[PDB]
Amino acid sequence: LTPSSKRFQPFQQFGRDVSDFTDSVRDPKTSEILDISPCSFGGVSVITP
Amino acid sequence: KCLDFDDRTPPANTQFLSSHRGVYYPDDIFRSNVLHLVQDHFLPFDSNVTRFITFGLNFDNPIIPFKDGIYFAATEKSNVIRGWVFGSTMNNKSQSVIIMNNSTNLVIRACNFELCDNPFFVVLKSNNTQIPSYIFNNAFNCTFEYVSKDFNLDLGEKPGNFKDLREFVFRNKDGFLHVYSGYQPISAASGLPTGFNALKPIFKLPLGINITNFRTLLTAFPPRPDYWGTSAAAYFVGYLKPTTFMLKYDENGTITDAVDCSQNPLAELKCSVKSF
Amino acid sequence: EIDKGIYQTSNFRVAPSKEVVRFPNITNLCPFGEVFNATTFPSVYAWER
Ligand SMILES: *[C@@H]1O[C@H](CO)[C@@H](O[C@@H]2O[C@H](CO)[C@@H](O)[C@H](O)[C@H]2NC(C)=O)[C@H](O)[C@H]1NC(C)=O
Ligand SMILES: *[C@@H]1O[C@H](CO)[C@@H](O)[C@H](O)[C@H]1NC(C)=O
Ligand SMILES: *[C@@H]1O[C@H](CO)[C@@H](O)[C@H](O)[C@H]1NC(C)=O
Ligand SMILES: *[C@@H]1O[C@H](CO)[C@@H](O)[C@H](O)[C@H]1NC(C)=O
Ligand SMILES: *[C@@H]1O[C@H](CO)[C@@H](O)[C@H](O)[C@H]1NC(C)=O
Ligand SMILES: *[C@@H]1O[C@H](CO)[C@@H](O)[C@H](O)[C@H]1NC(C)=O
Ligand SMILES: *[C@@H]1O[C@H](CO)[C@@H](O)[C@H](O)[C@H]1NC(C)=O
């Protein structure tokens, strides 16, 4: 979670991306839009002689 | 009290073309810079809208059937339109709700109402005073009432073109009147101007009753008692249809344009390509 | 025994550290007790939502 900088209409509560995934959420207690980011996925490969 | 006004000129049910206006935000979900197709109730493009006129030549407060949510537009400069009454039968037997800006505040009373068959506010000319109006002669079994914040409500008379356009969408979804509102400051001479508007929601009212009928609420501007005069006023009533629409959202997450799939074969293509 | 080359074998994972847990502030107590302990219960024909 980071702060979200996209402009947000007051009635707009959840911010969602192309796939309709919430990339931005409004905190209930502090109506701060928050950028939502994925958690660091990748593949483990082994180089070897 | 509860006056009924005689020999009102018939509205004649004049019809006009609809336009790209009548669009509202489907949901609070924020989508930006994205093309989205959605099924919902909307105002079809170029559809027929019934113009009901309270200019003064005619006064009409007809019971208008509430079908699947209505798009209301009021083109006015003196804020002559005051509110609306939504009810199934409105014969004092069934539940009805009154949403107006009566004197200074937004009032929404869901109560069984002795609906005056001619409900009209009484506004004094050159005094700018609302004489008490009996919107309901009495009230009994009042279920839901909400008084909003007080506001300065302009009731004086201004001569000109209708400088203001108040547009509302009333959707009776489940037992909820969902009202999506907007305003346009452009003044039009005598026509509902062509254009698109995006209606932000205001109230998700939980009335929980069936609404089959509704009547807008006008006001009197009689320069003399019992004369029953009115100023220039006009408005448009459009029904909504369950057709899918194609909406473009800018980077600001604001509705910028839309396309009705069913309207035109090229529009159908635009939908199927999901491109403009 | 493995001959020379590159080989993809695993999928890296980042685990969540903790939880944010944000709800609204409503603290009023619900009347479900009142509904359940309603002194009189209407008939099934007069069942009330
Ligand atoms: C979204 O809205 C903002 C605010 O209304 C727009 O930002 C403005 O952009 C203009 C032109 O670049 C500037 O003159 C203003 O100073 C900006 N204001 C703010 C508060 O940023 C932005 O351009 C809009 N984006 C759209 C319509 O795509
Ligand atoms: C919720 O309550 C907390 C604790 O007092 C407060 O810090 C926060 O601002 C409140 N938020 C809202 C939206 O009431
Ligand atoms: C709209 O009105 C025109 C003429 O007034 C009519 O030909 C047309 O069928 C109407 N469309 C409707 C009622 O959907
Ligand atoms: C008001 O409604 C009641 C029943 O709900 C009815 O008996 C009465 O006649 C109504 N008032 C008027 C003025 O008709
Ligand atoms: C308008 O409605 C409010 C709320 O019900 C009420 O207090 C006020 O007296 C009303 N004014 C008029 C002129 O009916
Ligand atoms: C609802 O209205 C009816 C008459 O229409 C009345 O008999 C009844 O007492 C009302 N209910 C309440 C809770 O006031
Ligand atoms: C409205 O809906 C209710 C509930 O389905 C139904 O009983 C009633 O007949 C409908 N029409 C009117 C005019 O109330």
Residue B87 CA to residue B80 CA, distance in Å, equals: 22
In three-state secondary structure terms, B132 is coil
In three-state secondary structure terms, B93 is coil
Residue with tokens 């356009």: B165
Method for structure elucidation:
cryo-EM
- Cα dihedral sign for B199, B202, B207, B213? negative
SS (H, E, C) chain C: CCCCEEEEEEEECCCCCCCCCCCCCCCCCCCHHHHHCCCCCCCCCCCCC
List phi, psi (to 5°) of C22. Answer: -125, 115
In three-state secondary structure terms, B215 is strand
1-49 in chain C: CB under 8 A from chain A:
2, 4-14, 16, 20, 22-25
Say whether B30 and A24 touch across the interface (CB within 8 A). yes
DSSP B96: E
Residues having CB closer than 6 A to ligand 3 are B 15, 48
In 3D, which of B231, B237, B214 has the Cα closest to residue B80? B231
Residue A25 CA to residue A14 CA, distance in Å, equals: 5
Contacts (Cβ under 8 Å, ≥6 apart) of C20: A1
Residue B160 CA to residue B118 CA, distance in Å, equals: 27
Q: Find the helix or strand (DSSP H, E) in which B71 lies.
A: strand B70-76
Residue B201 CA to residue C19 CA, distance in Å, equals: 33
DSSP B188: B
B118 CB near ligand 4 (under 6 Å): no
From B32, B34, B252, mutation site for ligand 1 pocket: most ligand atoms within 8 A of C-beta: B252
Residue B10 CA to residue B19 CA, distance in Å, equals: 26
